[PDB]
Amino acid sequence: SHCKFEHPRHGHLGFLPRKRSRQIRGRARAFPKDDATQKPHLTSFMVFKAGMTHIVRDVDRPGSKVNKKEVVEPVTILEAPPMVIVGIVGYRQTPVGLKTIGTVWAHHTSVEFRRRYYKNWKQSAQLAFSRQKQFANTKEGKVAEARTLNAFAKKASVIRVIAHTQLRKLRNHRVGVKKAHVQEIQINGGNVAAKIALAKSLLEKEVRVDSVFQQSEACDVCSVTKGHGTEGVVKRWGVACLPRKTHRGLRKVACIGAWHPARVMYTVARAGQHGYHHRTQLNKKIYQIGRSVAVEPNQATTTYDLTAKTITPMGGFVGYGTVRNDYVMLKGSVSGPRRRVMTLRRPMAPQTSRHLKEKIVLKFIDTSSKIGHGRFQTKKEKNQWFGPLKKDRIRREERLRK
């Protein structure tokens, strides 16, 4: 007999299996489509999540009820130290797939790059990339570098480079990892001879985030969801909770199937891992590509808001610290907790809708505290509400006593 009333089923069935991610980092399963009429350019960049805040900006949207009026939008801060290129891979088309031809290396690799090869670096011989380093400038090894660079020019359709996050310029105390996060970034643009020349030129040289993205564009954010353990069916799938007088329990799915087919189906919601899942989340509009504090002591300062202040709030981002490097600022949320490495990748969606072409100018960036209720935008404003306090008048008493 049919179900007596209709509701749409619970949970998208295309995000199955809802199992833990195989790896903690965001990894692109597909790059944008290669336009060979463009100029060669990188397509992804790894940033780390550093809390979130909100902004104020006026809206250019003709027809809308909020046209030329100021909105408050939440933004997420993603710290981006530059990544250093260490390799060049090239992939050739087969009827099986897309096979790797080989990789050249940079002749000089970082300590934190070849730390990724060790479960224990400090208690080790540390001699990785040590025979490749010395063979690469022999007579036969300078041949073998140019041997496989030519094999890219013959067989490869896809040229990628291998970068790593360069975590020692990320002077962060809470991201506790010291080995670098390694991914491959695909070159798109030009023919294969024009991709390798851009792959050779930025080799053993750091690439900075504002050379990959622009200020008022969008991107995809490949990132791994915040993990929540084993959760039941109400938290995980969002099923309705049963009436109060139910025996053995409320937070269950009552019927898990008919008598026939005499099996539980994959469509029936069950309990298990919730969170720590990979998500791609397209069309994340970017609002500000920031600049390091060694360059910019005044990061959150706008034309329309001349308060001299950085992007880091009062008392720091909660659980994270201070944004010490370049940063991107995206509209809204990205999947994952703070401190987690995330991949900003160029969009595969058509970036032609009038919401996505819109140029962004800000008017205010909230640099108030995220601990408690934020009240002051700078520490100069808290020293004008509060005058000299007691601990200041006895520090001024030690400074006169000397």
């Binding site: 099996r263 189906m265 994959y266």
Partner: protein, 221 residues
């Protein structure tokens, strides 16, 4: 499957010559899909090692729209409880042919698994198969003797590209690049092919004449 160091040191302790088993390589351009599959399913099960090549060129009788619907009725089948345990629907022409051979084998014994792993079934002609001897053909299954020429037929590479099989254009550029390469190799040695036959006509009258009218009785002149 690359050979391990136990399988590599024994080819150095014993000085193993490079070995190739007796492998019959069928060129399946313009063959009936199930008439070639039944000839192959019997030979594999008589102990023949068979490499099958050019599976995107196999023919199935009928309109392309007809045979494409019969694959989509096959793709309608899946285990509703858990489709990861279901019928797995292979879209490559090289994998459509392996299935059609396999459904003619005793698949659930070891003798029929030793015969389905004797079949390889590439599509296009890969670089390891090209220079390993002349390809063979199945003349009782070749569409010009098996299909009435007024009836439509269906190339398997075209039926399969519209139901899946995202490597149609890759195969078409690997086989355009081969026939260009293999025709450059064949304009070469045309002064080697003509060199021998102008030496095998010149070997006559340089050889004794009592071995020529026995070479003309059996028609080998």
């Amino acid at each position: 499957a690359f050979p391990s160091r136990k399988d590599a040191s024994r080819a150095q302790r014993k000085s193993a010559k490079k070995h190739r088993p007796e492998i019959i390589v069928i060129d399946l351009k313009d063959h009936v899909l199930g008439r070639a599959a039944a000839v192959v399913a019997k030979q594999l099960l008589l102990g023949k090692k068979i490499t099958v090549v050019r599976c995107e060129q196999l023919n199935i009788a009928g309109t392309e729209i007809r045979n494409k619907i019969k694959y989509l009725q096959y793709l309608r089948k899946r285990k509703l409880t858990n489709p990861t345990k279901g019928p797995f629907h292979h879209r490559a022409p090289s994998d459509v042919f392996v299935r059609t051979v396999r459904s003619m084998l005793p698949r659930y014994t070891k003798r029929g698994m030793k015969a389905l792993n004797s079949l390889v079934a590439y599509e296009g002609i890969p670089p390891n198969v090209v220079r390993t001897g002349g390809r063979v053909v199945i003349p009782r299954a070749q569409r010009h003797v098996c299909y009435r020429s007024e009836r439509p037929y269906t190339v398997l590479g075209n039926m399969c590209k519209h139901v899946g099989w995202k490597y149609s254009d890759v195969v078409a550029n690997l086989e355009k690049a081969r026939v260009e390469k293999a025709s450059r190799h064949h304009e070469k040695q045309a002064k080697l092919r003509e060199a021998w036959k102008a030496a095998r006509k010149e070997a006559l009258a340089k050889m004794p004449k009592h071995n020529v009218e026995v070479l003309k009785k059996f028609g080998y002149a």
